[PDB]
Symmetry: C4
Subunit: 333 residues, 4 copies
Amino acid sequence: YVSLADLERAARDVLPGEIFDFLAGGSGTEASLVANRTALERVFVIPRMLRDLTDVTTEIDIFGRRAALPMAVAPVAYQRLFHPEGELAVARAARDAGVPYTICTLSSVSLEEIAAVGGRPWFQLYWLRDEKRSLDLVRRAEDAGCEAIVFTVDVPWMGRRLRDMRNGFALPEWVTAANFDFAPATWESVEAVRAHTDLPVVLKGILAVEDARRAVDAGAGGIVVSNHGGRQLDGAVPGIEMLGEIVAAVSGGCEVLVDGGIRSGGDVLKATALGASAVLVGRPVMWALAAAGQDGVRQLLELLAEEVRDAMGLAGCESVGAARRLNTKLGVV
Amino acid sequence: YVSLADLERAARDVLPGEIFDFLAGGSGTEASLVANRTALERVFVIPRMLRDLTDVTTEIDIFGRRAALPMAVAPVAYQRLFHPEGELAVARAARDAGVPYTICTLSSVSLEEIAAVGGRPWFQLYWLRDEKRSLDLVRRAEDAGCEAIVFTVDVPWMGRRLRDMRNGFALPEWVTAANFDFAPATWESVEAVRAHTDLPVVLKGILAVEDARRAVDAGAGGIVVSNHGGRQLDGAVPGIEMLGEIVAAVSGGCEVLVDGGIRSGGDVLKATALGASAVLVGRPVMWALAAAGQDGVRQLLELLAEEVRDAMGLAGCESVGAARRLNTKLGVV
Amino acid sequence: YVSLADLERAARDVLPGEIFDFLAGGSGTEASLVANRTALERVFVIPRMLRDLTDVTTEIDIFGRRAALPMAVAPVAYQRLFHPEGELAVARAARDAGVPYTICTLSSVSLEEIAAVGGRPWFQLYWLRDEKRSLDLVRRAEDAGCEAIVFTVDVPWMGRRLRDMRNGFALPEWVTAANFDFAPATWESVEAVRAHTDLPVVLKGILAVEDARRAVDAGAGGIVVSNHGGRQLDGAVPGIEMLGEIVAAVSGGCEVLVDGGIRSGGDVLKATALGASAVLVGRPVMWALAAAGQDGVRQLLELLAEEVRDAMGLAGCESVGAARRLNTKLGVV
Amino acid sequence: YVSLADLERAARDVLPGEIFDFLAGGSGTEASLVANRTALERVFVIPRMLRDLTDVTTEIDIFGRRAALPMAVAPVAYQRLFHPEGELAVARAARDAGVPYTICTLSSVSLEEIAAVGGRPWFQLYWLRDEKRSLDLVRRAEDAGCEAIVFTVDVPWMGRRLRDMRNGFALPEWVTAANFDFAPATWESVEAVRAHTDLPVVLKGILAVEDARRAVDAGAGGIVVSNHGGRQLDGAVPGIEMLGEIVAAVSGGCEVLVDGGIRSGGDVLKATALGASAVLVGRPVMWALAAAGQDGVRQLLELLAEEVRDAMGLAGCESVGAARRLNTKLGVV
Ligand SMILES: Cc1cc2nc3c(=O)[nH]c(=O)nc-3n(C[C@H](O)[C@H](O)[C@H](O)COP(=O)(O)O)c2cc1C
Ligand SMILES: Cc1cc2nc3c(=O)[nH]c(=O)nc-3n(C[C@H](O)[C@H](O)[C@H](O)COP(=O)(O)O)c2cc1C
Ligand SMILES: Cc1cc2nc3c(=O)[nH]c(=O)nc-3n(C[C@H](O)[C@H](O)[C@H](O)COP(=O)(O)O)c2cc1C
Ligand SMILES: Cc1cc2nc3c(=O)[nH]c(=O)nc-3n(C[C@H](O)[C@H](O)[C@H](O)COP(=O)(O)O)c2cc1C
């Protein structure tokens, strides 16, 4: 594979169409899904030349640990839909690549099994029925060694995914929510989580500048600027279009991650030049999982690592921090 | 039906082509018809997160009455073209959904029959030959229980609909202007109407900021910012592109509605975030009528209600007023 | 015919392909030819409502004479290429419609014969070999009753029309430059013409703001803001994109006309709302001539008159002067 | 041939597909390759009229010598891939046209043989393993009569050309790096070159404004504003989009050239109107070489000379300096 699009083609061949659609689709007319890509394609980097590249490193420190790239695997529910080893295959590859892996509340393998793989697991929280059950899930994740709580804040309920409606998509009997034997989150829920863990709390799904500021004021250690891959509000702005304004407003008060449509190392460089600390990558990781299991995810992460190193050096950046100081110019496609 | 476009497909199958063209077409090159959609597709919403959604309501108060959604059925002439029950089918469904229905001067069932269905009828006025006949039509509507006079102000004469010209389109003998057994309106006509009814007068077809201000000064209770679905001046700006500037200029002096290309609950949310009090929806209501009569219109209104509730909650809005305080960002499509 | 595009289709059927290409083509990659249309399609009018339209007139006064529309027939060389009656057919139709007709230096019928048709003839000058011959041509036109000298200023030499090169296009033996039995113009040439006629001198092919100002200072009675239909510099800005800035800079010191891609009455309204006094129309007049001779040109001018009246009234304009006070908004297509 | 695109079509017919791909391709998704063309297509020139064109000259003085056009042949490695005479054919045609030819470090004929053709040779440097070998290459070029050192500064390593990867492209055994029997450059490398030659040093591949300023401060005699034809960082801004800002920042302190997508004399005029001193042209020269050897390159240069003269005169420019004072306006395509 020489690009992430090679993996997309491989996954479309292997997966049943309704499962490919569950993975690929967005809500409504898919305007926000397409806009995530349009927005990245409009950004051009202004590279710097002639800088010392003798020790080019793609590593970052985030939430108390080194990561090999400014990237983590995004939370994607129900990974056994894509390959029989599901989350364990992805987590193993992420561990071996030095990339954090986000364990989902709706994982198809229990969070303790995935955490036992090792690596740098984070845990994604969907707020449950009552505060007590939600905090017990956070405590399970912390006891299992997860390093951050990624509280998803853009799902008071799930969006209207018309491909899934039209296909009548349902989970096969062999895929379950393995952490179980939901109610809309509010700022009060965030405070309950913050008060009941020492782990950094990361709010995923922030798009408004004032919500990013409030996240810092609320004690978040990070945010993910995101429209949920275009799967929640159809017509929500792409995270990449709010990133620069959000980075300026928080002015270093928390880590600012972004997701949505990251499909190459050059896209990682664009996100960092707009001020992101790191990106999440969702669908491409599942393409690699579907195409070739653990080895497929390994190959994807090796390719992304090469593309990130390549883009950084071509742009004159010996570190991710230097990449954040690059300027950009919007173009037309 | 899971989107309004499903209804469009259904109506194209059933209607004779020349009737589909009378419904779908615009004037001239159809530049303004297409621009109504382009303009909405360029608007992206910046949703808010983590707000209390325990009592999410789509209701508004307008012109003295509660409506279940920030939406009314736009005036569309000659509804028996689309289904034998015509206006009565649409009015019944609107009444049952809690949505105001606009009775047309050129309705194919008399305004008194449609008003007898109940619900919240408004009456749309085209200015007649003389002031006396025009005021007698207003008085008929008021006596029949209509709640607002929607005075259409963008039709000094009808635009040049080339599809209708090319098709030689004419009304079948079985469709008539049932209120009868026109001259261009001016500001003097507006004053004559205002002086002769206690009902709110709503000027439909305002695009210039100074005409919106003059409408308030003239005693209008509302305006509809509209290019008449691209059927009048070809090259007229979309209403959605003037809405924000008009809302600022009137600064609460009247209700500001918008129409043209509203095709989902997400489009309703965009219109409200740009400052509209409510929208009108025209062609989709006739698609539903053609496809399945009263039950089709009911299904359309149920779908729109679900989409509006969904979009509002995903955007963190427990009320329409909160949706009007959302910010937007223009993108590229 | 219900649009000017109906005439284009008719002319393509009848004309030999190489003659259609001589008419339709531009220079180079045809970037400026296409941009003339793109630019008009981006302009949207903000119409006014509720104004008195009881005496809607499309007439203007220009260069000392009333014209029935804010339009003249652009200079197009060698009209016998398109129909055997050539310029006489076009001039007769223009006279009967009350539209000025521009007689070309490179007309295929002598300027005195075309002027004898009557109407409001203008004369277009290409600067000749020496001042004396050029002034003798101006004097012929004045003696024959031409009312204005349209000095074309964007042709120091002819542009590179690749369709004509590829086709090896040449004039048939039966088409000649009937005024004959060229050198680049300069500001000195303009002064020589101005000093040797009392007729208004109109500089056709101005795009830079400072050249429009210099034209006023040089004693021009008008300018035509134009890129020569995309036939001269490939990459020259469309006239319609410079019009507003030029109208502001001359601030009434001369008439400001525009051409390039005017294809409907709505396009005339756009040009006037951007500040033009009048437009020229070139290719569509030749489509009508090719399709149906004099009667075809008559039908084109009747259609344009109807479209201009329609667009003006729909926009609330009882006169061309009111149309010049309309505002516009740029959109995306 | 009447346009450069005629030569592209000719070269595609003759070259093996993998060699055409090595020539045509870019890195990654080819976003920067396409953007070089998009960016030029968005620029429109505002031509001036009525100026004296009696002595229109396309000549410039650059790096101490007259050139017949504001253009040089860009460095393109391994020209024997395209025709058996390779660099000698191109250099002969450039010499006869009065155009500088850039000899590559990776030329497939030795730099001394190409320099012996005569003309105005420049020499392009890729920084080698150690300073000593790199300076010996500069000294060879200077001893052979090269007039400028074009130090390429955007290749710390080569970009990821996916067409070449997919094709498994490799040099045929009959094509070698004839100057031989690389390490990333830095500002220190530039100073080493500057201190060891009296020739002007030209930094090729500058895009950031501060790197252009630093180039002047470092003693460069010129820069080439360039993204390396979209072959280095995928997502790098087109040089043409940075040119105006760079020309303002250096404020005459060095020559500012541009490359990337120049495909006509009109594109040369656009580059000069944006402030370039001259352009480089790469791929089209190789299309001409592939199509017809030396005579093909001669024909390309004659066509470009005609197109540059044509565009300059149509724009009212009797010299390249006048063309640099033209204004431009961005449009939409
Ligand atoms: C099939 C699928 C399942 C997802 N599941 C979750 C989830 O359980 N929790 C969450 O916060 N986001 C979830 N997401 C959103 C992703 O974390 C991510 O925000 C989004 O896919 C955008 O990144 P991408 O364009 O790289 O896929 C899911 C996305 C997909 C496509
Ligand atoms: C077939 C048809 C008939 C219409 N009849 C009327 C009318 O009688 N009075 C009126 O004010 N507008 C009339 N309109 C305009 C609509 O009220 C509305 O402004 C327009 O269709 C834009 O909304 P849409 O895109 O949702 O259709 C008509 C529109 C259509 C398509
Ligand atoms: C076939 C042809 C011949 C033309 N001949 C002349 C001419 O003799 N003198 C002149 O000033 N412009 C000439 N023009 C330019 C037109 O006057 C006009 O500027 C241009 O065609 C743009 O208008 P349009 O888009 O309506 O065709 C010619 C244009 C065409 C297409
Ligand atoms: C096949 C090929 C080989 C090239 N070799 C070199 C090189 O050896 N040195 C260099 O500085 N640039 C090299 N370039 C970049 C060109 O000099 C030039 O910057 C680029 O092709 C953009 O110009 P164009 O669009 O006119 O091709 C090469 C480009 C191509 C296509």
